[PDB]
Amino acid sequence: GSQLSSEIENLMSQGYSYQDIQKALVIAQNNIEMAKNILREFAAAS
Amino acid sequence: SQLSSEIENLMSQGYSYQDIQKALVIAQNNIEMAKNILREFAAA
């Protein structure tokens, strides 16, 4: 695996939807720290 | 004026003042990017 896919798997463990994670990475221009900020502050987790 | 108009326009779409601030902070004041965050994720 890669670092990015590792990060995505960790986000899903937290309950974020795959679609939210993708959207967040696109808006963030793949800056991971930024995408994490978006998800934390605005995304639902189940 | 330019910037306050942006906040006014976002609030008129129904975004809270606090969500707008959060989205600017995360985007480092890239207003285009903040608007994307709000459109895709924020309650309006």
User: Is B36–A43 a contact, with Cβ atoms under 8 angstroms apart?
Assistant: no
Write down the residue that tokens 């989205």 correspond to: B23
What is the largest distance, in Å, between two alpha-carbon atoms of chain B? Answer: 27
Q: Does A42 touch chain B (CB under 8 A)?
A: yes
- Bridge partners, A45 (sequence order): A16
CA-to-CA distance for A45 and B11, rounded, in angstroms?
Answer: 26
Domain that holds residue B44: 1-44
Query: Locate tokens 């306050």: which residue?
Result: B4
Q: How many domains is chain A built from?
A: 1
Resolution in A: 2.1
Whichever domain contains B13, its CATH number is 1.10.8.10
Residues of A in contact with B27 (CB under 8 A): 34
How many whole angstroms separate alpha carbon A17 and alpha carbon A8? 10
Q: Token pair 């939210």 is at which residue? A: A20
Report CA Rg, chain A.
Answer: 9
Which residue type, as a one-letter code, is found at position B5?
S
Sequence length of chain B is 44
Distance between CA atoms of A24 and A8, rounded to whole angstroms?
Answer: 11
Structure solved via: X-ray
CB A11 within 8 A of CB A39: yes
d(CA B1, CA A24): 30
8-state DSSP, A45: B
